[PDB]
């Protein structure tokens, strides 16, 4: 249910994560106090940050190039990250910290596809590591 896509062709590299407002933020309905509103603004603010979500290998050289962000009110949030790599080949794994700060979530439903090579996986808190 919470679902990411990793698609890296040449030196571009597109992240997406789709995942329902209970997994990001603990609710999915209007936040109803004050708590609850500054837990969807961190929420919003973090998923404008996907380099603190999806650490890349500084030897990779990404540039983060466009970010989208959907919230739909169930509620769901769907992060959208394109980056530019000068050095895609440096590019071996990526380390999420999703769970770390969004420790709702259980699971990811992960797929990667490098070039022509696809690969799926299931990862949680305790095994975040993608291979690339």
Do not use: M
């Not at 990404?62 to 895609?88: D, M, P």
């Not at 440096?90 to 700060?101: A, S």
Request: hydrophobic share 40%.
């Amino acid at each position: 249910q919470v679902e990411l896509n990793i698609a890296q062709d040449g030196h571009d590299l597109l992240l997406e994560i789709t995942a329902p407002g209970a997994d990001v933020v603990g609710f999915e309905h209007a936040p109803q106090d004050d708590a609850q509103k500054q837990a969807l603004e961190k929420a919003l603010e973090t998923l404008h940050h996907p380099e603190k979500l999806f650490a890349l290998s500084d030897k990779a050289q990404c540039e983060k190039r466009e970010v989208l962000i959907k919230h739909t009110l169930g509620g769901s949030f769907t992060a959208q990250y394109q980056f530019h790599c000068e050095a895609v080949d440096q590019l071996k794994q990526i380390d999420t910290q999703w769970f770390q700060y969004f420790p709702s979530t259980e699971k990811i439903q992960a797929n990667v596809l490098t070039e022509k090579q696809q690969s799926a996986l299931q990862l949680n808190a305790k095994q975040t590591l993608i291979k690339l």
